[PDB]
């Protein structure tokens, strides 16, 4: 008889212890906002999350590494540049297979043919 434990608590009651409106069609708004994120120039990853990303991801290489404020902004920009090129390549490999929707398998082939897998 297979058994498993899920409560994960040796005792119960742990807390009590001393220790008419318009709707655009599915797809309509998207092209309006393709244009919004394309005519715009801001950086599309929130700085505090991305800053925290670079801090949490750089710590393992070298202890107590400080980043110049402009250094993470160069990273922010470089990453967005990297991903918009990869996503144009994605859209191209997706329109190849008689499709509009992308799927990861599109971008593993896009990375494989570019030579980094």
């Amino acid at each position: 008889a297979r058994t498993k434990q899920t409560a994960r608590k040796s005792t119960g009651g742990k807390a009590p212890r001393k220790q008419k409106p318009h709707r655009y069609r599915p797809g309509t708004v998207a092209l309006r906002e393709i244009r919004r994120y394309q005519k715009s120039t801001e950086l599309l990853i929130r700085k505090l999350p991305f800053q925290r990303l670079v801090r949490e991801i750089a710590q393992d290489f070298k202890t107590d590494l400080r980043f110049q404020s402009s250094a993470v902004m160069a990273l922010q920009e470089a990453s967005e540049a990297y991903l918009v090129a990869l996503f144009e390549d994605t859209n191209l490999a997706a329109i190849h297979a008689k499709r509009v929707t992308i799927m990861p398998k599109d971008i593993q082939l896009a990375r494989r043919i570019r030579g980094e897998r």
Partner: protein
């Protein structure tokens, strides 16, 4: 770690929207975050290696575009 999910799903859509993409699968986001991190550890490994070469303990935008230079891509307005 916690900030890898900080690269949010609308932000990935915004990158895709800036990239001209109309429809996006639900499985794009997490492995796209993975592709982002492999790119980040590569670039910052090169950038930090440049940083402890300089007897330094901060990385600079100059060192970033320098790592990018090694990797092949160049960025402007961030020094260099």
């Amino acid at each position: 770690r916690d900030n890898i999910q900080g690269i949010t799903k609308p932000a990935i859509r915004r990158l895709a929207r800036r990239g001209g993409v109309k429809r996006i699968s639900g499985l794009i986001y997490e492995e796209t975050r993975g592709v982002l991190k492999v790119f980040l550890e590569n670039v910052i490994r090169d950038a930090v290696t440049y940083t402890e070469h300089a007897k330094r303990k901060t990385v600079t935008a100059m060192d970033v575009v320098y790592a990018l230079k090694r990797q092949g891509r160049t960025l402007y307005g961030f020094g260099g």
